[PDB]
């Protein structure tokens with residue numbers, strides 16, 4: 001059985017899985033229960049000496065997503081969403097969930113000094129666990145290419161438990177507990193990964209969906225100061241679908257509104273101090289109260305109930321303003337998207353069939369947008385069913401007359417043109433961007449949000465060349481191009497550059513292209529980015 005002795009001298013045992021060795025379920029913070037609820041995580045004080053860490057612990061508490069998709073998707077599309085599992089609640093779950101997991105090449109030991117890939121999971125900041133993202137395909141591929149890596153994944157608090165907001169959270173200085181969980185997991189790696197064979201100065205953080213939005217928050221955290229004990233906590237970042245979070249400050253209208261609603265639902269509506277009251281209620285009361293605020297696949301969709309918000313302390317301002325003001329870590333980044341990011345989210349508003357209904361849906365999801373702004377938005381993404389997402393499928397996939405334009409707006413603001421805005425203002429390091437069209441022709445969803453998880457962790461396809469091989473090459477060497485792929489990946493300087501600046505994936509292989517599509521959407525959306533915050 002593998003062993004490792006932590007920085008403090010505790011010797012722990014892990015698991016020999018033949019194709020790798022796993023140290024699963026190590027606690028890194030005190031259980032955030034009772035009056036530690038919603039507060040910053042506290043370092044685990046306690047001995048792990050003599051203990052065995054052979055299985056994943058429970059995930060943190062999950063919010064029910066509230067989707068209807070399983071009755072509107074064709075069997076082919078549905079089979080693939082079932083597989084990524086990013087839109088499902090994980091089980092088992094517990095408030096005592098803050099554990100970290102280290103998975104390494106067989107025969108690895110202290111002094112091997114391998115690059116470390118730190119994975120951050122993320123379904124809508126409301127669901128997810130580390131147990132649903134198998135490290136074995138990434139590790140087996142790293143060994144095969146002679147660039148072995150260690151895979152570390154960290155649990156963090158999602159939903160009310162991890163991202164409650166409003167005036168009282170703000171006053172107490174407890175905003176964005178979930179991101180602080182991740183950050184403390186990063187410090188733990190800085191202080192203990194050398195004992196497992198890793199090199200703390202070679203950490204690349206990567207994630208997909210809310211986990212990718214998290215990597216962006218970590219680049220902007222403390223105005224871009226990512227150092228811990230005179231060293232950087234990470235040297236590179238990979239963002240699979242997700243850039244800045246389009247959100248109002250922690251004490252803005254919706255953060256407050258969801259707080260009041262949750263406190264009433266938990267039976268704290270008449271408390272003078274609602275946080276004290278919420279730390280008093282039972283785990284079941286808190287879970288039920290949370291499940292009475294909207295889940296991300298409900299009609300509110302990406303007007304998310306729980307998500308990272310600027311607090312003036314650790315995320316000091318509006319994340320678009322921080323990016324154009326240069327307040328970020330200076331690291332090399334890979335950031336990319338699936339071609340049809342918003343189609344899965346489009347299944348939430350399938351009762352919107354007319355333009356007037358569409359106008360009301362945009363006006364209620366974006367409360368800061370003026371009519372003029374909503375008018376420009378609907379001109380940039382017209383009703384014309386050939387111009388929506390799944391992109392370039394003509395008259396196909398139009399579940400409703402508005403499904404494809406709502407899907408185009410959600411995909412772009414949430415993920416695809418938010419990446420372009422970052423790439424056009426980030427000068428912190430070399431930029432590499434990709435866009436996948438691997439699943440072209442898949443009915444209703446196209447190359448949908450989270451399909452990369454299947455080809456990164458379960459199956460091999462043209463996309464695995466980027467999701468495994470290029471990402472291991474980037475983690476090791478800080479250049480994707482050492483993977484030795486058939487196509488050379490172009491460095492991205494800006495969307496207006498001459499020449500191909502995007503690595504692209506189709507059903508058969510890789511090729512390059514340009515990030516110059518839907519410029520009208522990009523100007524409707526990002527001329528004044530606050531107008532479309534939630």
Ligand SMILES: *[C@@H]1O[C@H](CO)[C@@H](O)[C@H](O)[C@H]1NC(C)=O
Pocket residue numbers: 180183222313314
């Ligand atoms: C948040 O910001 C303050 C400085 O404003 C700092 O003292 C604190 O440690 C930061 N928290 C984290 C988790 O980095």
Ligand SMILES: *[C@@H]1O[C@H](CO)[C@@H](O)[C@H](O)[C@H]1NC(C)=O
Pocket residue numbers: 299351352353357
């Ligand atoms: C669609 O359904 C939601 C509830 O699921 C409702 O609140 C909303 O107003 C409906 N919109 C239209 C245009 O029917």
